Design a protein around this nucleic acid. Structure first.
Ligand SMILES: Nc1ncnc2c1ncn2[C@H]1C[C@H](O)[C@@H](COP(=O)(O)OP(=O)(O)OP(=O)(O)O)O1
Ligand SMILES: [Mg+2]
Length: 1010
DNA sequence: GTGAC
DNA sequence: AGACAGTCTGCGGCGCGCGGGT
DNA sequence: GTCACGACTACCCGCGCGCCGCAGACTGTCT
């Protein structure tokens, strides 16, 4: 009948016979079990200590369907051969690059288009440079338009200059530089090259391009780190540079270089600093103001100077690249890294123009309408208050109005005449004067973020007025009788200095002391001070009634603060995007499919945005985007949060997308389970693999149900406990999730959870310090151990770490937590690169009509026509299973669990959102969007027209030419240092639950070693 | 300052 | 009719709190 | 009954507000 499931000694299911044969081929691991039996016993003991032995898991029928064959006897051979296939011929052009540079022409000619100069010959006019490799730089007049003005290119033989018609006697500034990227394969090298790519004429096509734009900044960051640890490590570099510039003498003996050697191997990200560091070139930056002008006649003069400046920039960039590139080849030697770098350097965003303009208009209009309306009333209140200065008796009794500086200076008199020398407001109180910045200002300025607002809005805490102090922040007065009682409420007294200042101010104003000052609590802790009382996390106190106001505008101010902060943060970046319409370039916007079959109706409003993506902008080799990878999600009360819904597909096309499930937790569990060689050998690995997302039995959901919070808050809590957070911070997090709890309750819960999770600690001379008795002790010990190696490498692809964070460059300020995080956060980049390479290979092999659109970390999307949508989903599933099998085989296990093999959901839609069934109603958008479609593996297999067709025979013939070289895995290199007796005794001690047993094992080891 | 020696 | 020494008067750079994302 | 350093989520982007160091114009004796 049906096939029977296969189960380990632990109740975990594996793949079926067909999937096993097509993925892992034939393998045998029977010989390890004889050594593994002791480990199994240890694992069994651990599983009995936490009560997970004999507990049932999820068992389902096996899945079997045919797959495309592999190109080697192992996954490493397959991936290396496909990487060499996808990396050519750009890799050959990157090498054999010229070293000597040709001479510069004496005079430049002003002529529209492309002009080529060859030493010894006359200048010529050309249509395209038509070169394999060039170095490129672009200049533009940004205050006039977004279109380029001039450009220069350098090759191995000649020089090229491109001039716009706008500076050659024209009134139309809309022009783009042509390079024939749709038919000629080429490599263009530049510094921040995306900004230059955005100004190329033939890049505005839905059909794929054939040019590779390479960036030196990403190579420099990935190689040298730039001390970009986002800690005052970055501050010490600037401080040391300031100290060196201040000193006019250079002593032979150097102080603080012994303590911090890494100060000598770092620079900044700007091109001038990189050139000064690597190539010792002093690059002057003075002419950059000439491109800030409004009149174009300025550019007509000083033409030769500007062209020479741009050519000097080109020369510096070439000399920097010729030194940077071999180092990058040395640190990252796997072809998949280069293929992923090429894949992530080409992205496109199709939009529409009128919708974008309407969205911008509404988003600005609502914001200004709210802001002006509230500010008018605040100014009116200030005007009414400032009129009573003539009666000292009325305001000297008010508890709030008595804290203002009611002092007036005399009017100056010069030679018995009016001086009239910049006197802003004579004979007025000081608090009123400070509102006006200068004499020209006629109306006082005020904002809800000002400091005197809790004085203008009479605020009370526990039915007591608030008092501003110098040393502390906001405080309130409690009489002597109840001082002990409020100590039961865990409030904290202020320091003695503020007490003395309060005493002297009350003696100056002429009253007697009746109590003491208590501090308003702060969310972070008792040490921090409170400075603002109208921000987030004070709304709950306003709802309860602890914070009270005598004015109705406090609640409206809180609403306005909650509603319009993200627009205030991102308006300038959102409104300054470069959008190119269809009506201006009618010969460019070509369709993805060759058989267009006309159908140009109702397509009169189309646009394309090219993002400015830095492929490697972090120490962990992640990509950086300032606008599109920092975009908010749609919310019911947030203005302008519908940004990502503005990306729309043209008629006849759609978006197919996916996102990886529980990514880095799975990687950490795999690292922890690699010691025992069996999936589920540790308690956390067994807890992670028991259920699936579709049944609502994942670890994040269970944590949320136990803690009584949402799933995102559970994700934060779980990712906070790992990477080294304390119990006090966990208690503060629990307080912030549920603000109705008591301090002791949260402390007890956090203490119990940390005791159950991590365990206890032991210090021994032989085995240093180690955790024991917990369900995640082995994982913590392994993560601590792998970060102290001499040459740290990524376990999957073998990428190296930056020079700034290596051991030999550090004697103090170890920066330990980043070195702990680095490997786990850097494995995701390799995951993404493998996924992209697999998708590119499948698309090229089976002639699908698809192209990558956007990749936000572990989320990816593709633009696919209506005919090949389910084939694209199938290719995504195959890529996922290949990547997971690669990860499992590299770490030493030749099996894969069935539950984690495939994506949970695959999304097909027409816009970009997080969930298909979202109306996306915002305060600025009043129209709902129809829902999309989401599919799992069984529903995908049930549908027709989802099967791949006939393949091309020549692709495999081209792939088979490349070579394969065997390499040894990273953990196998790591395991050579330790003797097996040390390992077995350490593993035996890590699973014990009492100090006496560990001491006995240490004594037995000491007796055995002799 | 605080669980471990 | 300058000389110059006090004597204010704003103006710009810097750090920090506070929000968005995986 | 002492003790010896431990202890610490991570990676990115950017704006408004208070604070302080200076460049510049204005009297006022002074020659
Ligand atoms: N506060 C955070 N701290 C550390 N890492 C985080 C944090 N938030 C997100 N990440 C990291 C860990 C994730 O594995 C990785 C991918 O992001 P994300 O998809 O949001 O988490 P996830 O994959 O575990 O949940 P899900 O299964 O719903 O996709 O980014
Ligand atoms: Mg995910």
């Amino acid at each position: 009948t049906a096939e029977a499931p296969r189960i380990n000694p632990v109740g975990i299911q594996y793949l079926g016979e067909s999937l096993q044969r097509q993925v892992f081929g034939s393998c045998g691991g029977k010989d390890e079990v004889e050594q593994s039996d002791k480990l199994m016993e240890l694992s069994k003991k651990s599983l009995k200590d936490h009560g997970l032995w004999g507990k049932k898991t999820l068992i389902t029928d096996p899945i079997s369907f045919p797959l495309p064959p592999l190109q080697g006897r192992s996954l490493d051979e397959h991936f290396q051969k496909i990487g060499r296939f996808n990396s050519e011929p750009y890799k050959s052009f990157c090498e054999d690059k010229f070293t000597e540079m040709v001479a510069r022409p004496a005079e430049w000619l002003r002529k529209p288009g492309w002009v080529k100069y060859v030493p010894g010959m006359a200048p010529v006019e050309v249509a395209y440079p038509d070169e394999e490799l060039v170095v490129f730089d672009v200049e533009t007049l940004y205050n006039v338009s977004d279109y380029p003005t001039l450009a220069t290119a350098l090759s191995s033989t000649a020089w090229y200059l491109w001039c716009s018609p706008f500076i050659c006697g024209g009134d139309d500034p809309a022009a783009l530089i042509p390079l024939n990227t749709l038919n000629k394969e080429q490599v263009v090298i530049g510094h921040n090259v995306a900004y230059d790519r955005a100004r190329v004429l033939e890049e505005y096509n839905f059909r794929d391009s054939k040019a590779f734009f390479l960036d030196t900044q990403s190579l420099h960051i990935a190689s040298f780190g730039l001390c970009s640890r986002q800690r005052p490590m970055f501050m010490k570099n600037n401080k040391k540079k300031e100290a060196e510039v201040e000193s006019e003498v250079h002593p032979e003996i150097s102080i603080e270089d012994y303590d911090d050697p890494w100060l000598n191997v770092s620079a900044l990200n700007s091109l001038k600093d990189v050139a000064k560091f690597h190539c010792k070139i002093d690059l002057d930056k003075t002419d950059r103001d000439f491109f800030a002008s409004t009149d174009k006649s300025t550019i007509i003069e000083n033409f030769q100077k500007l062209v020479n400046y741009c050519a000097t920039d080109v020369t510096a960039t070439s000399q920097v690249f010729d030194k940077i590139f071999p180092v990058f080849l040395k640190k990252c030697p796997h072809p998949v890294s280069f293929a992923g770098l090429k894949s992530l350097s080409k992205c496109i965003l199709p939009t529409k123009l009128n919708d974008w303009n309407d969205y911008l208009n509404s988003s600005e209009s609502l914001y200004q309408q709210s802001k002006v309306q509230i500010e008018s009333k605040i100014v009116q209140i200030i005007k009414d208050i400032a009129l009573l200065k003539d009666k000292p008796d009325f305001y000297l009794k008010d508890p709030w109005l008595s804290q203002l500086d009611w002092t007036t200076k005399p009017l100056r008199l010069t030679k018995k005449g009016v001086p009239a020398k910049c006197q802003k407001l004579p004979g007025f109180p000081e608090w009123y004067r400070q509102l006006f910045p200068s004499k020209d200002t006629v109306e006082p300025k005020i904002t809800i973020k000002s400091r005197i607002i809790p004085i203008l809005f009479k605020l009370s805490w526990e039915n007591s007025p608030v008092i501003w102090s110098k040393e502390s922040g906001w405080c309130f007065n409690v009489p002597h009788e109840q001082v002990e009682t409020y100590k039961a409420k865990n409030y904290v007294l202020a320091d003695s200095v503020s007490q003395e200042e309060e005493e002297i101010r009350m003696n100056n104003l002429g009253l007697q002391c009746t109590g003491v000052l208590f501090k308003v609590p702060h969310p972070n802790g008792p040490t921090f001070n409170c400075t603002n009382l109208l921000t987030k996390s004070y709304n709950h106190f306003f709802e309860k009634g602890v914070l009270k106001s005598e004015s109705e505008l406090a609640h409206q101010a809180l609403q306005i603060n909650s509603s319009g902060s993200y627009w205030m943060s991102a308006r300038e970046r959102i409104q300054s995007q470069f959008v190119v319409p269809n009506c201006k370039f009618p010969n460019e916007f070509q369709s993805l499919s060759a058989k267009s079959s006309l159908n140009n109706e109702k397509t009169n409003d189309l646009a394309i945005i090219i993002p400015k993506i830095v492929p490697m902008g972090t120490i962990t080799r992640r990509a950086v985007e300032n606008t599109w990878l920092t975009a908010s999600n749609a919310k019911a009360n947030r203005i302008g949060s519908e940004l990502k819904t503005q990306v729309k597909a043209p008629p006849g096309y759609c978006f197919v997308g996916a996102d990886v499930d529980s990514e880095e937790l799975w990687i950490a569990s795999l690292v922890g389970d690699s010691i025992f060689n069996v999936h589920g050998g540790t308690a956390i690995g067994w807890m992670c693999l028991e259920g699936t997302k579709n049944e609502g039995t994942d670890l994040h959901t269970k944590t949320a149900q136990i803690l009584g919070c949402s799933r995102n808050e559970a994700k934060i809590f779980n990712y906070g406990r790992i990477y080294g957070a304390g119990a006090k911070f966990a208690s503060q997090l629990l307080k912030r999730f549920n603000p109705s709890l008591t301090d002791e309750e949260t402390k007890k819960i956090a203490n119990k959870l940390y005791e159950n999770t991590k365990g206890k600690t032991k210090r021994s001379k032989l085995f240093k310090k180690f955790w024991y008795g917990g369900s995640e002790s082995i994982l913590f010990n392994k993560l601590e151990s792998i970060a102290e190696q001499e040459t740290p490498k990524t376990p999957v692809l073998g990428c190296g770490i930056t020079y700034s964070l290596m051991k030999k460059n550090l004697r103090a300020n170890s920066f330990l937590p980043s070195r702990i995080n680095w490997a786990i956060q850097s494995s995701g980049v390799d995951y993404l690169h493998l996924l992209c390479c697999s998708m590119e290979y499948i698309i090229k092999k089976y002639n699908l009509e698809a192209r990558l659109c956007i990749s936000i970390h572990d989320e990816i999307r593709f633009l696919v026509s209506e005919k090949d949508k389910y084939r694209a989903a199938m290719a995504l599933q195959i890529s996922n299973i290949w990547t997971r099998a690669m990860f499992c085989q590299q770490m030493g296990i030749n099996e894969l669990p069935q539950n984690c093999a495939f994506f949970s959901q695959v999304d097909i839609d027409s816009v970009i959102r997080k969930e298909v069934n979202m109306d996306c109603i915002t305060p600025s958008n009043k129209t709902a969007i129809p829902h999309g479609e989401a599919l799992d593996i069984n529903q995908l297999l049930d549908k027709p027209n989802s099967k791949l067709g006939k393949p091309s025979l020549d692709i495999d013939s081209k792939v088979s030419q490349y070579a394969y070289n065997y390499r040894e895995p990273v953990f196998e290199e790591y395991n050579k240092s330790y003797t097996p007796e040390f390992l077995k005794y350490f593993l035996a001690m890590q699973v014990q639950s009492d100090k006496r047993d560990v001491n006995r094992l240490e004594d037995e080891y000491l007796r055995e070693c002799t």
